[PDB]
Structure 1
């Protein structure tokens, strides 16, 4: 299986990347250094993760060391919700570029379809706890993203957490100049996303699967929650293939023609998670893993469920 997938901007994207949400700032520099040393060439970042400076230190040190050339790296970041206004998009991108110590991003995503009021707070709230929306609409934010391509700041633009009607809205934008290259969505055996994936792929949009291990370190995890890494049925598939459960969970989206971005700050796991190019799940394995779907979604914000662009009211 080829290690990169061709995007609709003509560039190739590594199908395995390193996630960085929740990677502590005092550990993420070493995590990214180790990842690059063991073969990762794609890093998934975001301004809201509050660790792009430290990610950037690692990237810059490996470029300076000539462990890797810039053209071999595929660096992704995301425009946070408080920067959807057209006049804020460029500065938000520039802050990410400055922090990552780069002069372009390979891919820049609208992080969520919901725009929030600009200001210092990433989740501006009213006095009852609802997020304060922006009166920005995704189409104007998209035009601002297109301008980043034309200014040389980013090679590709895309979207994240867009439902199929929101994807369709952009694809139907009057005067659309660049199609989204990627839609990055939650996807794993408990949230298999068949409908949304088929739609995006049929339009030439590459899907990236986030939280492929079920995000066991998410801050709102409960003790009774489903656990992919502990599911005996998945452990059994892993044992049959002489692989770890995490390796099965990473290989699964790869065989659906998805990109996948498991997060770790543990050096041994960073290396383990990359050793997924030397085995194949059978069709039966794939269909069996798909059968575990329960529509169990771990990444959503209750504060956003009344936002006009909240993405998860729709079936898909």
Structure 2
């Protein structure tokens, strides 16, 4: 298992990264410092997570300490839904760069295919609770992303939570200049994503698996929801390999040629989650884990279900 995967922009992306959604601002600086100290070279960020300033403090300190060089890091962020308009994309990217204290991103993603009305609120609502869309379309937002490459702000551009017809819309865009390098999607044994993964990989688009542990800290969790980390069948596979359940859940996407971005703020877990390059799941293990699919989504975008670009009506 090599540590990096080749993207269709010619750059190499570390297959293991640190997630930062829900990482409290008063803990994420230490989390990222520890991660870099124990070998992580890829951090997954987003403006909407409201902690990029604190992530940036950690990155900058480790660069200043010469623990790593900038070229060895792979920093990812995402354009939030209220910035899909042509005239807002550059400023949104620049705010993320300023907060992360970087002069380029390795990868910048359209966070969701749905554009929302610009303004201070990340989820602008009408008086009856529906998200207010913007009349921007995917293709014009993509052209704005391409301009970021040509201005030197980002090395690669990609998409997140795009279904296969939305990916196809970009691939078929008139005048397409840069293909998406990555589609970042939810993926784990309860949402195995075979169809969308095969489609993206067949087009040379690398898939990143988010919520690989089932996001046990997601704010809308209910006690009755399935729990990957507690699933006795997954625990049994981990026991057989003398690894933790989380380690199996991280190794699983790696062996499907995916990038994976588990989140933790706990130093011991940050280190544990990186120790996944020393064992192999068998083909039988892989097929058994795939068999647990139940089309269960952590991130269903349930308040956007009437948006014209809502991604999860299509089968994939």
TM bucket normalised to smaller: over 0.9
Q: Say which is worse superposed, 301-310 or 80-89, in terms of deviation.
A: 301-310
* In 1, Cα distance between equivalents of 2:212 and 2:302: 22
Q: Deviations over 1:60-118 (max 9, x none)?
A: 00000000000000000000000000000000000000000000000000000000000
Q: Deviations over 1:242-276 (max 9, x none)?
A: 00000000000000000000000000000000000
Q: Deviations over 1:176-198 (max 9, x none)?
A: 00000000000000000000000
**How far off is 1:218 after superposition?**
0.1
Q: Secondary structure at the match of 1:108?
A: strand
**How far off is 1:298 after superposition?**
1.0
* 1:198-277 aligned within 5 A: 198-277=198-277
Unaligned runs of 5+ in 2: none
**How far off is 1:32 after superposition?**
0.0
* In 2, Cα distance between equivalents of 1:301 and 1:181: 23
**How far off is 1:305 after superposition?**
0.3
Q: Secondary structure at the match of 1:214?
A: coil
**How far off is 1:300 after superposition?**
2.0
**How far off is 1:301 after superposition?**
2.4
**How far off is 1:26 after superposition?**
0.1
* In 2, Cα distance between equivalents of 1:302 and 1:158: 23
1:305 lines up with 2:298 in the alignment: no
* In 2, Cα distance between equivalents of 1:208 and 1:137: 23
Q: Secondary structure at the match of 2:250?
A: helix
Q: Secondary structure at the match of 2:303?
A: helix
Q: Secondary structure at the match of 2:294?
A: coil
CA RMSD of aligned residues (A): 0.3
* In 2, Cα distance between equivalents of 1:258 and 1:275: 17
Q: Secondary structure at the match of 1:131?
A: coil
Query: What is the TM-score when the length of structure 2 is the normalising length?
Result: 1.00
* In 1, Cα distance between equivalents of 2:128 and 2:243: 48
Moved over 2 A (4+): none
Q: Secondary structure at the match of 1:298?
A: coil
* In 2, Cα distance between equivalents of 1:88 and 1:52: 18
1:168 aligns with 168
Query: What is the TM-score when the length of structure 1 is the normalising length?
Result: 1.00
How many residues align? The count is 316
**How far off is 1:303 after superposition?**
1.4
* In 2, Cα distance between equivalents of 1:198 and 1:225: 28
* In 1, Cα distance between equivalents of 2:169 and 2:123: 25
* In 1, Cα distance between equivalents of 2:44 and 2:186: 14
**How far off is 1:302 after superposition?**
2.0
Q: Deviations over 1:26-65 (max 9, x none)?
A: 0000000000000000000000000000000000000000
1:97 aligns with 97
Q: Deviations over 1:126-183 (max 9, x none)?
A: 0010000000000000000000000000000000000000000000000000000000
* In 1, Cα distance between equivalents of 2:128 and 2:45: 31
Q: Say which is worse superposed, 190-199 or 295-304, in terms of deviation.
A: 295-304
